Structure formats: structure tokens, C-alpha cells
Symmetry: C4
Subunit: 82 residues, 4 copies
């Protein structure tokens, strides 16, 4: 896949994760964006995490859709910076 | 390996992790499924984790059997969605 | 890329992460260095994490710039030790 | 590298991580073994983590030496089980 397409795909993931955490778990937009990156990068500090059943299901969907997308995007970003 | 076989393998991992956490650590089925994905994806928030010696041993077995299986499944899922 | 260049790149990442956490979140130099490795390796214990909006933004930048760099450096280190 | 050699290398990593956490941070042998796997797999729940400067330095060394070794071992284990 072209690198710019990979960019759009991870941006879509980030929008999905951020809006979902904000509306389901009720955290601020900024916290939700931070949490989304921390989650799809697999860092997972746990300072924020879902505490409702819907949030838990949503987080599983973000894990399945986002970890692989993020991994490819960072590998591509490596090529253009190195 | 065919992608559908990889699917069955990660599903078996998920059943194993979920039933094990539920019965050993006594968390609900839903929490246990959430914890299983959080663990095999290596996100590891730590909002849930084993607090008994048997749970710790079991979690090591899930880590060894499940992280690699999950990694392959997400890579394959990437091919069919992209 | 030559392995020594990869070394310099991860060292630059480590300096960036350490100085940034120290000045933005006000933790000690030693804690900040520890946190930087824990973050770019994706271990993410969460014993330390940013609690300010600027720290959260900075941590996202470190995640994007550092996880891929660290992954390549450990793979290269594997070749020279094995 | 032959798969059996990779096995010995990760076993050496596990001994190093376990004995080090036990003696530096004073946790039990069993907790220390659990923590070692949780760390080199990059799960990093944070239910256990070093709280002394020496423990933090040691944990960085385990992160650098162990994450790559564990990754190769799980990939090899995947071949013999699948
Ligand atoms: K991780
Ligand atoms: K954590
Ligand atoms: K983690
Ligand atoms: K974590
Ligand atoms: K990889």
C-alpha cells in the first residue's frame, strides 16, 4: 500500500478511537486522543481505561482494528524519516 | 497457514484465556474476555491482573501461547481489510 | 541502515524523551530516563505517565517517533549479540 | 539460529530477570518470574514495577536484552506448534 493511504487509514483509526472513548466513557477529547494512541501503540499505561461493558467491547474493536494499522504506519514513517 | 485456520487458532486462545481468568481469578465472563484481548495484544492496562499464584502461572501460559497467535491474526486481518 | 547509525537514532530518541518528561512533567532525570525506555519499548507499566495536556501531546510524539526506532535497534542488537 | 539455542537464550533472560527483581526489589521468586514474563512480553500491567533507582536501571537492561529475545522465541514456538 502507498504510504499516504496508510496515513489515512491510521487517521481514521484515531478518529474512531477518540470519538468512541469520549462518548462511551465520557472522558475529554484530549484525554481520549491520548488514550487512543497509548492503546493502539500497545503502551497501555492504564491511567485511563474503559470501566463500562460497552467501553470494554469498543476497546476490543479498537485493539483489533488499530494495532496492526498503527504498526504498519510507524514502519512506513521509518522509511521517510530514515 | 490459511487465514481461516489462523482465525480458529486465535479463537481457541481467546476461549482458553477467558475461561481461565474467569475460573481462576473469579472475574466475570465479560471482564475476562476483555482482559484476554488486552493481554494477548500486549496492551496490558493493568486494570485487571491475576492476584493468585495459579493465576500468575496461567497468565504466563496465555502470554506464551497467545501473543504470537494474536500477532499473526492481526497481520492476516490486515490483508483482507486493506 | 548501518547498525551504528541506528544506535545514534535511538540515543537521540532517549535524550528527547528523557528531557521532555523531566521538564514537562517535572519528574527526576532518572525516573524520566526509566519512563522513556518503558514507553518506547511499549511496556507501559503506568507507574509514571503524563498528567498535563502538554505532557500528553509530548508523549504522543515520543510514541510515534520512538517505538519504531527502538524496535529496529533491538533487532540490530540481536544480530551482534547472537 | 537453531530453535533450541533460542530456547536457551530466553531461559537465560528469564533467570536473569527473575533473580534480579527478587534481590533488587525484594519480591518473591514467583512474583519475580511472573513480572519477568510480563515485562519481556511488553504486557507491562504495572501491578509490579521497580521502585528503587537500581531496580529501574536493572529493568532497563532487562528491557533491552529480553524483549527481542522473547519476540524471536515466540515466533519460533509458532513454527513448531503450527
Ligand atoms: K506492548
Ligand atoms: K499498565
Ligand atoms: K503494555
Ligand atoms: K501496559
Ligand atoms: K514484527
Amino acid at each position: 500500500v502507498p504510504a499516504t493511504r496508510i496515513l489515512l487509514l491510521v487517521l481514521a483509526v484515531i478518529i474512531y478511537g477518540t470519538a468512541g472513548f469520549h462518548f462511551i466513557e465520557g472522558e475529554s477529547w484530549t484525554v481520549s486522543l491520548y488514550w487512543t494512541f497509548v492503546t493502539i501503540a500497545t503502551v497501555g499505561y492504564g491511567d485511563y481505561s474503559p470501566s463500562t461493558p460497552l467501553g470494554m467491547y469498543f476497546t476490543v474493536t479498537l485493539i483489533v482494528l488499530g494495532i496492526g494499522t498503527f504498526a504498519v504506519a510507524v514502519e512506513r514513517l521509518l522509511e521517510f524519516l530514515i
